[PDB]
Amino acid sequence: MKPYQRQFIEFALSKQVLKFGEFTLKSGRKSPYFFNAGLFNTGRDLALLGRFYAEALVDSGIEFDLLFGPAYKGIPIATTTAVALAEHHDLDLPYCFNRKEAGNLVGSALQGRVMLVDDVITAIRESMEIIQANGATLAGVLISLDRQERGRGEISAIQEVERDYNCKVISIITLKDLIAYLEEKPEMAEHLAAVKAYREEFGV
Amino acid sequence: MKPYQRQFIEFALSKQVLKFGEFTLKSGRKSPYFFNAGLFNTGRDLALLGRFYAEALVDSGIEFDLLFGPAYKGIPIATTTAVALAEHHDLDLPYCFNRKEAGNLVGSALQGRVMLVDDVITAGTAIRESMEIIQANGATLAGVLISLDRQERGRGEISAIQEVERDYNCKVISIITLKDLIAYLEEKPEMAEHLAAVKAYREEFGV
């Protein structure tokens, strides 16, 4: 994997954003790992989070004119990603985010090719409606982890977003990266087996 | 003024946040200048803005445990200020913000001495909302930090910042004040007409 992907995994583990064990997802599915970015809740966590998103954006090669953060979780993420692009990649991007009621936008004018940044896709439909109503284009959606598993139907929730809004979704890391990481850790052999078994049953 | 205050004024001028001209405020007053912090609307703007807030906070000497940003405009301000404190001041601070309606909170637990950060303020429903949340959670308000204190009368005899302070016995600090804008305009011949207009406005409305 790329260095920023390895570092993001280690960062998430250290803050217990990423945890391996026996969990139940929103759906009710039994899952061998959990990812919850809410525990990125200090200035240092925010600083690093923005650098990871910024590195994933530059790595993707996608062209975009504006960074959009969905209310509410997307607002700090877009802010720190925009800072990191300016400080560490010499890229000065307009940013924008929505209010859930009234206009309904904060930041730069919503125009051009829009990169949406958010924590996960299991807020997004609401922000997509705003981007379309303003006549802007979707350059992409960047989230932290692509779990690469079926949603309620046969395709993943990410694939459903891609289909419904004709946009590419990219991620900082994927389930494949988690598995590659766990292969290097002998003490995590038990978790690796459980993750591979989960992928066999629910993976796409 | 301190160097970071002069640099903040230069920054606001460069991004058209600070404009000298003819304007009408929300109160109908006719002002010789306007300050619209919403025009700090790019990543580089956000990066620098956080660094100026962080410098004003450290320079204040006020001790605090958590940064709170009121929804919505305070959320990016608290975020970039927290980033700047961690990256440029070796200070790793919890942050928190509210959701406007179902208080409903995002981030670290709301407790300890809270520094509220926003772009501007005024005694009213918005600020009273943030303060009730802070007190409801059993936290202490260490202060409020804003970008510019216009130092002009509200509808009473005190300024909007004094209203917030005197009505709620809290400390408000600012990156710059009207006094600093006047000091910046001095001995710049190309701004002489604006200096006189600002000074005239202050004589009429300044507190």
Swiss-Prot record, chain B:
5-phospho-alpha-D-ribose 1-diphosphate binds at residues 26, 72-73, 99-100, 118-126. Pathway: Pyrimidine metabolism; UMP biosynthesis via de novo pathway; UMP from orotate: step 1/2. Its cofactor is Mg(2+). InterPro entries: OPRT, Or_phspho_trans_dom, PRibTrfase_dom, PRTase-like. CDD domains: PRTases_typeI (cd06223). Keywords: Glycosyltransferase, Magnesium, Pyrimidine biosynthesis, Transferase. One of its GO terms (biological process) is 'de novo' UMP biosynthetic process. It holds the Pfam family Pribosyltran. It comes from the Bacteria. The keyword Magnesium applies. One of its GO terms (molecular function) is orotate phosphoribosyltransferase activity. One of its GO terms (cellular component) is cytosol. Its EC number is 2.4.2.10. NCBIfam families: pyrE. This is Orotate phosphoribosyltransferase. It comes from Escherichia coli (strain K12). The gene is pyrE.
